[PDB]
Amino acid sequence: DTTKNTKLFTSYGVKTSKAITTEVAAKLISKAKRPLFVVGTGVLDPELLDRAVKIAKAKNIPIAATGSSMPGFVDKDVNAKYINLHQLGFYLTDPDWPGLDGNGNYDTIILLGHKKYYINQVLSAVKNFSDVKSISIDRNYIQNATMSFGNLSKADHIAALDEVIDLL
Amino acid sequence: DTTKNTKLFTSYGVKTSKAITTEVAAKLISKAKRPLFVVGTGVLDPELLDRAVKIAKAKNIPIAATGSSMPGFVDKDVNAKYINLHQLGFYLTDPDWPGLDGNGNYDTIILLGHKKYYINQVLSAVKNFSDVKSISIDRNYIQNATMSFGNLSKADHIAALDEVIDLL
Amino acid sequence: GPMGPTPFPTAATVRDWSFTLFDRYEPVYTPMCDQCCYCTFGPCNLEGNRRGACGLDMKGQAAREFFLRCITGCACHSAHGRHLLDHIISIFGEDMPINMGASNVIAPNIQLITGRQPKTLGDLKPIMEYVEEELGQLLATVHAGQEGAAIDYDNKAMLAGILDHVGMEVSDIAQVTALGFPKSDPEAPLVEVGMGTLDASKPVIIAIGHNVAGVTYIMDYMEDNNLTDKMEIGGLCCTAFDMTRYKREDRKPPYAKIVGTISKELKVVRSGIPDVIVIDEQCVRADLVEEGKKLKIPVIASNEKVMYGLPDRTNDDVDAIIEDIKTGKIPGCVMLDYEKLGELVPRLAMEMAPLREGISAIPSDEEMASLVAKCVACGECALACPEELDIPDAIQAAKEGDFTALDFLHDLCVGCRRCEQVCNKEIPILSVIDKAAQKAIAEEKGLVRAGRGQVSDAEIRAEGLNLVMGTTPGVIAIIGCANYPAGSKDVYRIAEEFLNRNYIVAVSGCSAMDIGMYKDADGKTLYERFPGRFERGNILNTGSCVSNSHISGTCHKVAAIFAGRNLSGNLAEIADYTLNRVGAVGLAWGAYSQKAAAIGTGCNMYGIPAVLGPHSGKYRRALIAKTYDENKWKVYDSRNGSELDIPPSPEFLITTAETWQEACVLLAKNCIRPSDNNMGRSIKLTHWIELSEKYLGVLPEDWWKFVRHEADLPLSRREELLKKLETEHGWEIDWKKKKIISGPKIKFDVSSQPTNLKRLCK
Amino acid sequence: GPMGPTPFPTAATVRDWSFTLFDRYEPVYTPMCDQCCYCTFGPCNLEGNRRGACGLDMKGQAAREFFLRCITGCACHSAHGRHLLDHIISIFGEDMPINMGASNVIAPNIQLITGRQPKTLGDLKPIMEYVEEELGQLLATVHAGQEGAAIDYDNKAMLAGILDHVGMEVSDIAQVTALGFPKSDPEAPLVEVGMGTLDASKPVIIAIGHNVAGVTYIMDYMEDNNLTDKMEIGGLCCTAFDMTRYKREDRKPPYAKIVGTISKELKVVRSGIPDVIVIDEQCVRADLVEEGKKLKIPVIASNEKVMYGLPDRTNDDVDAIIEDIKTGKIPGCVMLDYEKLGELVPRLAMEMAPLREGISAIPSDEEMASLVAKCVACGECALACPEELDIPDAIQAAKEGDFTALDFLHDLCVGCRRCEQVCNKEIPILSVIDKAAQKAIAEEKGLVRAGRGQVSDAEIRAEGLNLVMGTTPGVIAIIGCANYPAGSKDVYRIAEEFLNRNYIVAVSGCSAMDIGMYKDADGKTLYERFPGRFERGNILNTGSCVSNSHISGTCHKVAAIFAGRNLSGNLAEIADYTLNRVGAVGLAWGAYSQKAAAIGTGCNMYGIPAVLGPHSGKYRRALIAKTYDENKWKVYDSRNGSELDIPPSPEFLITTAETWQEACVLLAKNCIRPSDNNMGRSIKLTHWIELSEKYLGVLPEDWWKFVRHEADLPLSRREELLKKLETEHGWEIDWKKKKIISGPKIKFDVSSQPTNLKRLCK
Numbered sequence A, B: 001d002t003t004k005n006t007k008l009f010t011s012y013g014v015k016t017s018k019a020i021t022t023e024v025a026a027k028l029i030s031k032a033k034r035p036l037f038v039v040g041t042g043v044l045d046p047e048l049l050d051r052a053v054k055i056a057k058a059k060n061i062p063i064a065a066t067g068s069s070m071p072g073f074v075d076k077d078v079n080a081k082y083i084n085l086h087q088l089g090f091y092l093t094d095p096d097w098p099g100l101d102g103n104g105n106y107d108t109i110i111l112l113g114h115k116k117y118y119i120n121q122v123l124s125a126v127k128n129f130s131d132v133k134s135i136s137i138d139r140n141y142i143q144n145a146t147m148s149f150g151n152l153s154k155a156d157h158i159a160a161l162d163e164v165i166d167l168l
Numbered sequence C, D: 001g002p003m004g005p006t007p008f009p010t011a012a013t014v015r016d017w018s019f020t021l022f023d024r025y026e027p028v029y030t031p032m033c034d035q036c037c038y039c040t041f042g043p044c045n046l047e048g049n050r051r052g053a054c055g056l057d058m059k060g061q062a063a064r065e066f067f068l069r070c071i072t073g074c075a076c077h078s079a080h081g082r083h084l085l086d087h088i089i090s091i092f093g094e095d096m097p098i099n100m101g102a103s104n105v106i107a108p109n110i111q112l113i114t115g116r117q118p119k120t121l122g123d124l125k126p127i128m129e130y131v132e133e134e135l136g137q138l139l140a141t142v143h144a145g146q147e148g149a150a151i152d153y154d155n156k157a158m159l160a161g162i163l164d165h166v167g168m169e170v171s172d173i174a175q176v177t178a179l180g181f182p183k184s185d186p187e188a189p190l191v192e193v194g195m196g197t198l199d200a201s202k203p204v205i206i207a208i209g210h211n212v213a214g215v216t217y218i219m220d221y222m223e224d225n226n227l228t229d230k231m232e233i234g235g236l237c238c239t240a241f242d243m244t245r246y247k248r249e250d251r252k253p254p255y256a257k258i259v260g261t262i263s264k265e266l267k268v269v270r271s272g273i274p275d276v277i278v279i280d281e282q283c284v285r286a287d288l289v290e291e292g293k294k295l296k297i298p299v300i301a302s303n304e305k306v307m308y309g310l311p312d313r314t315n316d317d318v319d320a321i322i323e324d325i326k327t328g329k330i331p332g333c334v335m336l337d338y339e340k341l342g343e344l345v346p347r348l349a350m351e352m353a354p355l356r357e358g359i360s361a362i363p364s365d366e367e368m369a370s371l372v373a374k375c376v377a378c379g380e381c382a383l384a385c386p387e388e389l390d391i392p393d394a395i396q397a398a399k400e401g402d403f404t405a406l407d408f409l410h411d412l413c414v415g416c417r418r419c420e421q422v423c424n425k426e427i428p429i430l431s432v433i434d435k436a437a438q439k440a441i442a443e444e445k446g447l448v449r450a451g452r453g454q455v456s457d458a459e460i461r462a463e464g465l466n467l468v469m470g471t472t473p474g475v476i477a478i479i480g481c482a483n484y485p486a487g488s489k490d491v492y493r494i495a496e497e498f499l500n501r502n503y504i505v506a507v508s509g510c511s512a513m514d515i516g517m518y519k520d521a522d523g524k525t526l527y528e529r530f531p532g533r534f535e536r537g538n539i540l541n542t543g544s545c546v547s548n549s550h551i552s553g554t555c556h557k558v559a560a561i562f563a564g565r566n567l568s569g570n571l572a573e574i575a576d577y578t579l580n581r582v583g584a585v586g587l588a589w590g591a592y593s594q595k596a597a598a599i600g601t602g603c604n605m606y607g608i609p610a611v612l613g614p615h616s617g618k619y620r621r622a623l624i625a626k627t628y629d630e631n632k633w634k635v636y637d638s639r640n641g642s643e644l645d646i647p648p649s650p651e652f653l654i655t656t657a658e659t660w661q662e663a664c665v666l667l668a669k670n671c672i673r674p675s676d677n678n679m680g681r682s683i684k685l686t687h688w689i690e691l692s693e694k695y696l697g698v699l700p701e702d703w704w705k706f707v708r709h710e711a712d713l714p715l716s717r718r719e720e721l722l723k724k725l726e727t728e729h730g731w732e733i734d735w736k737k738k739k740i741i742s743g744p745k746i747k748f749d750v751s752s753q754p755t756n757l758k759r760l761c762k
């Protein structure tokens, strides 16, 4: 039940993200054309790092390790690259950005382990000045995303991540 | 179905009114202790005036005829008094206001036939600086009310008003 | 000469007077937002009067937002004044004596606030420097963690308002002295206003903004090139008033035209009539270039405040810019050189008129039918309309062959095209409405009297006793913007209703334009029906937005010239006199801008109440008094010092009405002042009761609270009102002589002098 | 003397330089709101870059909001400067020569912007008048319908930023010249900073604000009454720096103490230590009176900007005010008389110390246990926390007997009590955290070097060559507020990491306070570990918030004194030199206020990039360049005029980082400049690569784009990097002599002179 609690302290406006279940998020990630996995330093928690690695490996998703989360991906066998999150949000709005690997922009970004007040400010520009889709699979309900999980506890977040991995 | 369409162009904040059905609004009006019927000039429409008169008579509700809606109540056998809507909102926030008849303040106000951008600005002060409850039974969804009808067409508004009168 | 206690006031200098005002008229806060967003600690949810991360609550945040609006308006007027004064001194010289008209108090607001009596143009610079200093301090107060209480924000808002009035007075005085404006002329020429007054077979220049410095140069080029009868120059907003006042002390009709208010800008652009658009300053739409490049309408900026993102070709040759514009390289340019601009704009219009023939955004009849048939009635346009117009119903009617609904919607619409950006059928709703009302638009003509300027001292002596005693029912200052709730005719209806009852109606700004757009059954406007002096039954137009300082200074001169007070540094005493004796009320039925808030706050600090439209609740702050409480309506007698009770009038300082009928009733009731004689009270009560019966259907509930004598009652209906007092309230009236023997709570004393200040009471 | 092309600049005067800057570093907009709420036409939904009723779009509205923030910060600094200068001239006189230290360019920012070289104090008044005029114009531009393009708003924001730097320079110069501040002292005394440094057995005065004049009067009274050792006076925010710099040119330790930043205000109030709180100016909490009246802590206001709704007893006798405060009639008062305030505050603290004994908001152990047991874990406090601290988990741990979670939360918390207003159990969460960390609070002591002021010319000549060539890896200006994301130790970690690598770290404001609060394993702070000159490996503290003008003027003086340019009216040339050659980067890890935005924008206009904390994305605007595009990184060679390619550095002008490790990497990379010699490039590349491997775990992906020669590579790891270039990128390196023969795109020319301007290119 990732769609129950969608409480916010403050609101950006009338528009808000759609609360989704694990099945819907799994379908959206599996049917994505050119997805990107944007992860902040919050992913370095041991219970989140293995889940993120398994999600990325299950679908061969390139990883944008913003902040200082890159050290948690060096040993793993994934395609992860460092980029400043603000610069990544600026570059996603440019249609002719070559991308991290130089093969074109991305149409869907999966967000995990981010500070609410930071990912929300990046997603504001991303959603208002581009056509990229955003799926927040974190434990905080993100308003500025396109699709997002609701407010969850850490145990519930882990269970939801396992559910998403099962259907991936 | 008065709880389906609750769309807004702009949002005052996270807090919003609860969309209610005709049965719930009828119960709230019938169980009110000291209600007031705040009506603007939009009530002067012929299909709304008789409905407002019947609602007020069914429960002996004193009427605050804000704007220039007073001429539509002179001939009828209701207790209606003119008061500026801004001044009424200012006076409702004072706990020791004698009231229109001088018998004390009111705990519930029913709102009908108001401009959205005007009743919303009055209800902002009413809800943020007082403990008065507000029930909007108009065709526009009011955010700053406590309980409110959803967006409705004129025919649907008339049908909902008849439903409320039936259960009154 | 003698000096008052408050010259060059600051926040602490006026805090006692503001506190006295707020004791009676409590600030009502209507927050437009549940959150504050000033600093990065936020956004902070303040619902329920909670406090933010800095400790500021909802009331404080609303007061700070209103204070920011007021200082913004003050800044606009002050920057206009500074630019105008610098240009005027650079051209004409700073030794040029001030010529405002036929009076001795040339600068009433300036003398009242700063205690100065300027004689030449150079003497106005220190006033501007003081205004800039105070503006800097007040803007510094906006920072996070700079004020915790809302009442101090309200005091600083009053200070900003009076600073705004000083700035407007400076600007208007400079332009009237320099540019040959009419010098307090009761008979200033009638000028043509309206969209349909423009001859579209000629090259058309359209000037938008408030500054006329550049415009005057264009007019000089047109005059000396004998192009006045070959081209057509029209203006929108207050710059139109300024150009139509240019060099009109000779009192001959102008050749420049007035197109309309801010609501008409996009409609005029979409009509395709303009050939070249030149924009100067504030009140200019931000989509002029985008909407004009579709119809090949070049845009020329002329001020640093509005450079519109256009290239800066100020130093380039005129012919090069003309060729680049003609080829289509650029949609316009920025020209900060006044001679160059005055040469370039007429030539650009001349060379662009033959290029763009028949280009317009108005749909054809078949195109209009297809656009109407495209709609599916989803209701997003109605949701997005600021005026809540029933667009889907009008379009549904249009599908059946009826265009009366859209024609009716045309006048209510403010031409903002916020409905077009939410339609998924891409229907140009504004253009559809314009097409449906193309006949009424073609018939949109009217007459408006040019801006006379200030009021001379002779008229002040003539009318002071009548105004103070109540012989004249009062002054109605119809000012403000054009954000009307239900169309532009409400101001006309109010002005006619109050001119028929012999009020003194003084107008300015866009409201004068909208008043002059409607004619009676015979076909005359109010300006030609009623004279334009300063007396009962006369509607006078002061001019542009910076001319409201003339109305405020007229109140100050009524206090000074008649009662013999001293203006210099005497804000509190003069404001108290105006609040207690002068029956003046203002009306801004369509106020939207920050300048309107600044002007209203400045008028409030001077003691003048104001009514506003329903959209003005978004300003977040009103000033309303409590009538049920009796300790609030108590003053001191100036002769001795005893406690004197006064009627609850005015019952507000800033309020918002819903409809124009209620606005008429409120304006009639709020002209009542203490210290009114029996005859003045009789006249005011008669008008108030008659309007209340006409528009609300009932006799006012608290009418008896304003009766002190049997002579206070209306003479025509004295007996029935005496019987009502006898019955409803159980009073004691002697029927033998028809006099009031018992029942009133305030006794009538002719020589009673109500004052709010004990320092000058003896 | 010679004059540049831009003296007394306006918006149109600096538009070319701003456009050149924005061509490379595009403005990225991050709207904090989907709606605009400026006028009553709104609120207008602008989601999807839609346009409002006035035609302004989302990008324009975000630019206007950022511009308003910048002008607000400029207004605060300018008002501080004007008040300080007026007081200084009224006391000491306007003929007093300026004494900033040992230098010839006394006022670098002033000379650069206005082309003036002031000698006495009176010469600073016209600068302030010009700043006030420009502030008035810029605030007038905020009005609705005053600008349609976002790029022009960005240009006006740049202008506001440089005006803010001018105002800060004026204020700091005046106070240093008058109040006997240290005159560019490399060895200024160490002062004690921290909550635990206050002796609570003595009467305590706590000064909050930024203005120090009244504080100086209080200090004079304490000194001449021999009360320095009997009382304790501490300060919060920049006024603490100002009082600790007062009369310290004699270089003896001060007796006044520094308590902390804005985050410590409510914690110190809740602790009950203060006996009398006196507030002066900006950065003052709005709930000081409400939270202080519970603990009987009187509040005295001393400025018109912050009256605090308190009564005005300025003209009343001191003993009367003391008696009313003691009896409890009022929670404080406003005292605008400096002599009377300086007498009153110490006496009030003396007479209030014995009255309030043991009064504090810290819960008892049993009370703390009951409060912890009251919680039900509903999660509203975590939702309302600006820092997203896991309050419910800490309270759940506290229920079991463990208080380490709340102790850890103590440092991260900013003391805003936004969590307390959403708890339905009425648990004082801030007080619970303070109780849990009461030992660590008692241990909170540290040392900070006093504000030295500006940098003398001799050190400028000593370090100019080292800086311009890169021998010194660069300058890190750690400034700004205390809205840190993850505690106050991040600035300390960054400062230590960069001092260990021989950078020049210059600090000011609250960040210096937070840097001085942490000691090593031995027990020394960075200020005593490293010297305080202007050279490699030295951390110097300029002083209060208005001392950032000294860092900007240090960059200006590096450009002028060394390269022999002319400062007067030469903003564009000096800024281009700084952007192309001087390796200076700023860091505001906890910026929240509008003054921070103004200072950052002013630094950007001068060519200094800046990293900011994650909370700074709420400012709505960053300046980021596109590295993949190659046309952006092209300049002209100043000797001839040909096209010269430059490395993408700096890659931003304003950016926000997430964690302090990424911030360290960004600061290391953004010190790289063109025109670096082989040794400077080698040092900068070594530091950047080492930091990237240490914090991010990888060698930077674009490290090869900054290599022009085999000598550019680090000397220690030359061979492995040459092999990497040979393999990964397929370059051509001659292994016989270990030299680069083919591969690099920008050849290395020692005498190459990269410039962004063609006017001065020959």
Ligand code: SF4
Binding pocket: C036, C037, C038, C039, C040, C041, C042, C043, C044, C051, C052, C053, C054, C055, C056, C144, C145
């Ligand atoms: S100014 Fe105060 S209320 Fe507004 S966002 Fe900042 S901390 Fe919150």
Ligand code: SF4
Binding pocket: C374, C375, C376, C377, C378, C379, C380, C381, C382, C391, C392, C395, C422, C423, C424, C425, C426, C427, C429
């Ligand atoms: S938004 Fe367009 S389709 Fe929908 S009701 Fe309005 S006109 Fe019709």
Ligand code: SF4
Binding pocket: C384, C385, C386, C387, C388, C389, C391, C412, C413, C414, C415, C416, C417, C418, C419, C420, C429, C430
């Ligand atoms: S353009 Fe006219 S009809 Fe359309 S939203 Fe604006 S006011 Fe309403």
Ligand code: SF4
Binding pocket: C033, C034, C035, C036, C037, C043, D032, D033, D034, D035, D036, D037, D038, D043
């Ligand atoms: S104050 Fe205005 S801009 Fe700020 S959050 Fe509220 S509506 Fe949006």
Ligand code: SF4
Binding pocket: D036, D037, D038, D039, D040, D041, D042, D043, D044, D051, D052, D053, D054, D055, D056, D144, D145
């Ligand atoms: S300024 Fe423009 S966008 Fe903002 S509320 Fe007014 S009309 Fe709407």
Ligand code: SF4
Binding pocket: D374, D375, D376, D377, D378, D379, D380, D381, D382, D391, D392, D395, D422, D423, D424, D425, D426, D427, D429
């Ligand atoms: S708001 Fe109060 S009850 Fe709810 S989790 Fe936080 S401390 Fe516990």
Ligand code: SF4
Binding pocket: D384, D385, D386, D387, D388, D389, D391, D412, D413, D414, D415, D416, D417, D418, D419, D420, D429, D430
């Ligand atoms: S007081 Fe501390 S814990 Fe409470 S909301 Fe503010 S920052 Fe968070």
